[PDB]
């Protein structure tokens, strides 16, 4: 396709997997399973599902930090994800488990009539931005809705897994994570006077 | 006037009230009362006064967060206000009351009494939140950053209904939008592991 | 040195000490001692050493805040330094003492070698004292994730102003750079922060 007689339109597509040795890379397998890979060994599985895996209200961050059996990169990703959630106030909605250096975090999206002021929308907005390549299919509506985002699934599960080429629906990318880095603690609530 | 023989000087004045549905809008009513408005519905009233409304030294934010019952935009504004207070160390200076979902926050400016004190930090954040004309409330008005002080004893932030209070200065999002960037820049550590 | 037969190369070295009344200024004295001066009066001394001074696992920040006997500028510097640490997750690694308005902070670097708390503390030390912190580190460059020193303790103590700067000139660059990274690398320790 030549423009003004002499200018051919040519396309260029970046192989983004080569950025694996410096930064995380996030992709979508299908609407229920999404992934964020940190190198060629490990990563986190972001699963939207109706089946709960954590059935307790304990999360125990301090014990996990003291033991220090976890991967530091993965915990940094978890911290960025949580601190990017706008207006998080219902702490019972979140639970987690770190026994033996594992990472397993569960957000209860069924904790929620208008369905626009809920914590589930903060969780789903941050999930959408974290897996920005292909998260849009997992939501009820692809666009035209930010404050009132919803999905039919009841739980979001962020759990550590092994590396494997899951990137079927969208190609891997760091853009969601790198965008979320600048927004940490930007729209969170105070919880104590002195902080 | 007319410049270079062909250029007439003309002016604009932006109708900033039309930004109401997207962002807060702050203005000054008189010396003591200032306001920030959220929607055409609600907002916070910032009153500098000598009369307290909270006589206790408790502020349990976590219990309010558990129950919800509050307008999330207003509590976001409160969090943006408090987090941007530079060098806040006297926790007893601030009290609050969220019973029934309302918002009431009281900063005791007389607790810390000349320069480089807690009251000055609270007034620095107040002047930025209500930058549209809050300079009248502060004593000097200008030439003072670390020594800002006002004759009033308490700063009281209370949720209110919408009303055209913007007599002294026009409504503006500029103060709030400025405070968003400079959010956690001057918080002291109170813990080894935050 | 004349370039093009037209232009003479001329140099320019800025005296940063005139920024003393507006911002901190950091410099290096020798391998072990580094300094950050505030005003013509006060400052902090950052000493890498094999000898501890605190010898307890307490750091009563909350009590120091109520007593309010300390220098606010120095405690702001300490707050920026601590919150700039990448992945501080060992609360026992740090101790301090604020008796009577004093400031005496200690980081135990013995907890080690790549990707540990001591490396993060040494990274933040490198940025805070950027004017000559490289001499203390085992490798001057070519290393970020495995920075290590032979010293077990980094000790930050409030001191008096004096012409400490021998190895590098005073400079605000480390502090001003750390102000932007002040909170962007923090672990969550609690669900509702």
């Amino acid at each position, epitope marked *: 396709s030549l423009y003004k007689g002499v200018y051919e339109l040519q396309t260029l597509e970046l192989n983004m997997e080569t950025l694996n040795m410096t930064m995380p890379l996030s992709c979508t397998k299908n609407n229920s399973h999404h992934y964020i890979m940190v190198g060629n060994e490990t990563g986190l599985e972001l699963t939207l599902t109706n089946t709960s895996i954590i059935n307790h209200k304990f999360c*125990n*961050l*301090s*014990d996990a930090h003291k033991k220090n059996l976890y991967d530091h990169a993965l915990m940094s990703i978890i911290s960025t994800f949580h601190l990017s959630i706008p207006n998080f106030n219902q702490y019972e909605a979140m639970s987690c488990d770190f026994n033996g250096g594992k990472i397993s975090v569960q957000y209860n999206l069924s904790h929620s009539a208008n369905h626009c002021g809920t914590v589930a929308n903060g969780v789903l907005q941050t999930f959408m931005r974290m897996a920005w390549g292909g998260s849009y299919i997992a939501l009820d509506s692809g666009c035209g809705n930010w404050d009132c985002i919803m999905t039919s699934y009841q739980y979001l599960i962020i759990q550590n897994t092994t590396w494997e080429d899951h990137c079927q629906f969208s190609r891997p990318s760091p853009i969601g994570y790198l965008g979320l880095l600048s927004q940490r603690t930007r729209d969170i609530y105070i919880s104590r006077r002195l902080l | 006037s007319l410049y270079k023989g062909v250029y007439e000087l003309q002016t604009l004045e932006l109708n900033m009230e039309t930004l109401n549905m997207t962002m807060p809008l702050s203005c000054t009513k008189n010396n003591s009362h200032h306001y920030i408005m959220v929607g055409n519905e609600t907002g916070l009233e910032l009153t500098l006064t000598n009369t307290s409304i909270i*006589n206790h030294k408790f502020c349990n934010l976590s219990d309010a967060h558990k129950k919800n019952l509050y307008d999330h935009a207003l509590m976001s504004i409160i969090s943006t206000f408090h987090l941007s207070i530079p060098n806040f160390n006297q926790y007893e200076a601030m009290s609050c009351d969220f019973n029934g979902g309302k918002i009431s926050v009281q900063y005791n400016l007389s607790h810390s009494y000349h320069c480089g004190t807690v009251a000055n930090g609270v007034l620095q954040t107040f002047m930025r939140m209500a930058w549209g004309g809050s300079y009248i409330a502060l004593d000097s008005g200008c030439g003072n950053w670390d020594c800002i002080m006002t004759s009033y004893q308490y700063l009281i932030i209370q949720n209110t209904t919408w009303e055209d209070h913007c007599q002294f200065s026009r409504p503006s999002p500029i103060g709030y939008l400025g405070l968003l960037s400079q959010r956690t820049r001057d918080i002291y550590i109170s813990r080894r592991l935050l | 040195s004349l370039y093009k037969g037209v232009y003479e190369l001329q140099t320019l070295e800025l005296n940063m000490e005139t920024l003393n009344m507006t911002m901190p200024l950091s410099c290096t004295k020798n391998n072990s001692h580094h300094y950050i001066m505030v005003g013509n009066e006060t400052g902090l001394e950052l000493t890498l050493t094999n000898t501890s001074i605190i010898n307890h696992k307490f750091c009563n920040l909350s009590d120091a805040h109520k007593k309010n006997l300390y220098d606010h500028a120095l405690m702001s510097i300490i707050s920026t330094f601590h919150l700039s640490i990448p992945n501080f997750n060992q*609360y026992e690694a740090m101790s301090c003492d604020f008796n009577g308005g004093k400031i005496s902070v200690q980081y135990n670097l013995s907890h080690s070698h790549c990707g540990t708390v001591a490396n993060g503390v040494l990274q933040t030390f490198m940025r805070m004292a950027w004017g000559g912190s490289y001499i203390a580190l085992d490798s001057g460059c070519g290393n970020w994730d495995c920075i290590m020193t032979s010293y077990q303790y980094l000790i930050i103590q409030n001191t008096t102003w004096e012409d400490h700067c021998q190895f590098s000139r005073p400079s605000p660059i480390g502090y001003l750079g750390l102000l932007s990274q002040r909170t962007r690398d923090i672990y969550i320790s609690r669900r509702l922060l």
Partner: antibody
Amino acid sequence: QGTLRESGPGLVRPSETLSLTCGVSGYSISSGYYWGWIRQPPGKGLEWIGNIYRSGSTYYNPSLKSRVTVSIDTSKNQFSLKLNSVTAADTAVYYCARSGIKVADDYYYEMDVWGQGTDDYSYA
Amino acid sequence: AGLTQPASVSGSPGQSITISCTAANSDIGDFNFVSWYQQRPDKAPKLMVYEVSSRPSGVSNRFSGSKSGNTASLTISGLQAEDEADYYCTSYTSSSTFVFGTGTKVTVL
């Protein structure tokens, strides 16, 4: 659940020091609860003496602030009151108490070591 | 100084009775988390109400508290003869100090 039990001298003379020990069985004093002494003179209303916390911090009545000490011994699982310069007005029944209060001073101090606590503070 | 409280309240079986507990207007900050205790004769006080109407397990729903302004109160709905006891209100003063009332002698007629 558990019990609290006073033990000490049932008789002191004027100007000597009363010393009462409260033993706690079935509850751990190292749990986040405030251990206190209340007083009932024989026929009058209740008067709160004081309390101590596992951090060692103590809080006292303003009237009874110069004469009283309250100590905690977690190793034997007990706490105790020491009231010096006793007088006739100090004749009374002394009660132990487990209190679910939240003092901000002890809250902010234990955040790193003991982590996030509960929110079921009865304040009673 | 101590919280003002009625010296005696009384009623017949089955009716509701109210025991008030009033603080001075100069000590409103000392009037918080008003909790109510029953002391039977020659027994230790037992907590009946804490916060506002929250009660320990085993305490019936007949005991219910309220708080407004400078005053609080305990309502015993459906009074019975076993409710005769000395009722004490106490507030948690913001200097971390429990302040008791003077005690109410409930009489059942």
